[PDB]
Structures are given as structure tokens and as C-alpha cells.
Amino acid sequence: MRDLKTYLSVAPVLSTLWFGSLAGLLIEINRLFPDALTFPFF
Amino acid sequence: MEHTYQYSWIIPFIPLPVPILLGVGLLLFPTATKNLRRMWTFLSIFLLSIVMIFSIYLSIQQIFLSCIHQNVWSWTINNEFSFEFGYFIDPLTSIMSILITTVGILVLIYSDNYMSHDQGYLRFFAYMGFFNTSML
């Protein structure tokens, strides 16, 4: 869709998409590996 | 074994209806069925593919299970005939069935282009499908 990809390219729409994806990533990581205080995998 | 040999009577009769439709098509409406020129080709190839898959399935059951099925019906019952037309599934049946079907499918894929510049097209595939019917 022309000019919708330009709107979704705009800084707030793109920032909310990036930070929603990133926050879901961090959230699911903390579900998978909750309560982390060390990196023991070396 | 329980429900797959009772439907072993179709593997002669599955190629049959496209030579039946060509034998009433070319003999009655030649412009019509020759206007449907390449469709009966793929229909014969598809019906022989059905017979190929079913013969492969019977071959898999022959190499797994050692049994012979002799699904005979009755054909004439008047006197000493009591005739049958049944279907005898030995390993020789499996070898011969895949030997017919694979070669016939490949010759039909070949014959789509071998006859593609032939005025005689559909009666050749009627002869092909009726031959595959008869040999199976």
C-alpha cells in the first residue's frame, strides 16, 4: 500500500512497532528465563 | 487388508472411462472432443496415476504381508460355467501392475508431445487407455 508504508516508516509508528516487538521479546525472555541476576552460560 | 482388497476390482476399470468418452466422442461429435484435445490426455494420465498409487499401495502390502487375495465375483451362473472375473493379487500381480502403470504413465507423458503434431490424437489415447485397461 503506497503512502501507508511511508506513514509506518514515520518515527513514532516505527518506534512503537520496534519497541513493541522489543518489549515482547524481553517479556517472553523473562518468562523463559525469569529472575535472572547472572550470565552463567559463559 | 480388511478394506483395500475389496476395492481391487477398479484397477482395470479406472483407465476405461476416458476411452469410453473418446469412443463416444470422436464417433459422434468429432469437433467437440477434438476441441477438448489435451484434456483427455491429462485425464488418462491422472486415472493411470490413481492406478499407479493403488498398485504401489498393494505392492507395499505384498512386501509387508505375505498373502494372496482372490476377490472373485460371479459372471454367469446357468450351468457348469459358474464363471468368475476376479482379481488375483500375488507378488506377480504387484510387479506386473507397477510394470504396466509406470511405463504407461511415462509413455503418456511422452505421447502428449509425440502426437502433439498429429491429426490422429484422441483415438490414439483411446487405444492407449483401453490397452492399459485390458492389460491391467
Binding site: 500500500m1 503506497r2 503512502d3 508504508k5 | 480388511e2 478394506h3 483395500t4 476395492y7 484435445r37 489435451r38 484434456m39 490426455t41 491429462f42 499401495y57 507423458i109 502428449d112 508431445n113 502433439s116
Partner: protein, 212 residues
């Protein structure tokens, strides 16, 4: 003979009497002007969406086949305990996770070759060359080829190429919707598609979605 001639402007539309959009002139197969939202405005993206529709429809067609035909064989007495929406949970070898990564490897090769076709058409060419023989340059999504057009039906042998591609696309849109029906009515009935068909054909009035 092999030109991919489009549909005329006075073609049948999805909504008769409506104006087809200007970005659906008819170059693509199955062009009936369906665009209430207009997701195919950018033609460089409408090409990708046409390829998307084509591959989506081909996979949906193979899938609806692999759902209904084997269920017919189960009703005939060939396959045991068949249920497509429980045929991933049931047992095989390779745990269904080794199968997944082997699938991703092999389909990654295949769909990556297709991707390289999409990005740049002549990169991954097949149907090997022959002396004094000019293999025709194909289109994206319809490679032709010795492997995908061995009967030579794509260049327009039995029927024209446009009507055959339209046949592919229409039959496949119908298959896409059939698979959506599979994915929905196998979870809101927890039953078999062919069983649902025979159940609705028993009493079409009261055996509908509103019973459940």
C-alpha cells in the same frame, strides 16, 4: 501463442456496477477488481502480492487435497485414525522437531531459490541449455521449466496462458477459503471436515454453525 494477454476493461468484477481500481487493469490472472481497501496500490508491491497470492494458493490447494483425499481413503478403509488437526501431534520418527529443522533446511533451499527468482528473475535458471535451442524466458511464479512444465501446458498448449493462470488462481482462492474453513470448523466443531459435510447434508437447516 505465449504472450499472457490481459483481461479487457469490460471484464466481470467482484462487485458488478462498481468501478475497478486503476491499479488492477487486468495484467494479473484472476483480476476482478477486488480492492475495497487498496492494498495493491504500489505496483512494485502488487507484484510481490501477486506472487504471494500464487504461492499461498498453491500451498492451500496441495493442503486441501492432503486433507480431503486422505480422509476419503480413511472412509474407504486405507488409513487409520486420520485427523489432520491431530496429525501433527501423533507419532512419527524424528520427534517432529528434527523433522521441522530438516524441513526448514530443504524448504529454505527451495524457497530461497524462488526468492532469488523474485528479487532478480534470471539468477537460478533451470531447464538446462541445449544447442541451437532458446529456452523461453519465463515469468516470476510461472517458471515453466522441465521440472514444472514437463507437459508444456504453461506456454498455452491446451488453452491460452491467461485463462489457465486464472484457473490456477481461482481454483486456488477457493482452496485458500476451504483451508480457512478447515482451520475454523475443525476447532469450533472439533470434528472432521467430511464429517461436517455429511452432517450438514443430513439436515442443512439445524446442523449449521449456530448449533456447534
Amino acid at each position: 501463442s505465449s504472450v499472457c494477454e490481459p483481461l479487457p476493461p469490460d471484464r466481470p468484477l467482484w462487485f458488478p456496477g462498481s468501478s475497478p481500481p486503476e491499479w488492477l487493469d487486468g495484467s494479473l490472472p484472476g483480476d476482478f477488481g477486488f480492492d475495497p481497501l487498496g492494498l495493491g496500490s504500489d505496483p512494485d508491491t502488487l507484484k510481490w502480492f501477486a506472487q504471494a497470492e500464487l504461492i499461498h494458493s498453491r500451498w492451500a490447494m496441495l493442503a486441501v487435497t492432503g486433507i480431503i483425499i486422505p480422509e476419503c481413503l480413511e472412509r474407504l478403509g486405507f488409513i487409520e485414525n486420520f485427523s489432520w488437526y491431530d496429525a501433527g501431534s501423533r507419532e512419527y520418527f524424528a520427534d517432529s522437531t528434527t523433522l521441522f529443522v530438516a524441513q526448514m533446511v530443504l524448504m529454505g533451499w527451495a524457497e530461497g531459490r524462488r526468492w532469488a527468482d523474485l528479487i532478480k528473475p534470471g539468477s537460478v535458471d533451470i531447464e538446462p541449455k541445449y544447442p541451437h535451442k532458446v529456452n523461453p524466458k519465463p515469468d516470476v511464479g510461472y517458471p515453466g521449466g522441465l521440472w514444472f512444465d514437463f507437459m508444456m501446458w504453461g506456454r498455452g498448449s491446451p488453452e491460452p496462458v491467461m485463462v489457465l493462470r486464472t484457473k490456477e488462481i481461482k481454483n486456488g482462492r477457493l482452496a485458500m477459503l476451504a483451508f480457512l474453513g478447515f482451520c475454523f470448523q475443525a476447532t469450533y466443531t472439533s470434528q472432521d471436515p467430511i464429517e461436517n459435510l455429511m452432517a450438514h447434508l443430513a439436515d442443512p437447516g439445524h446442523c449449521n454453525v449456530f448449533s456447534a
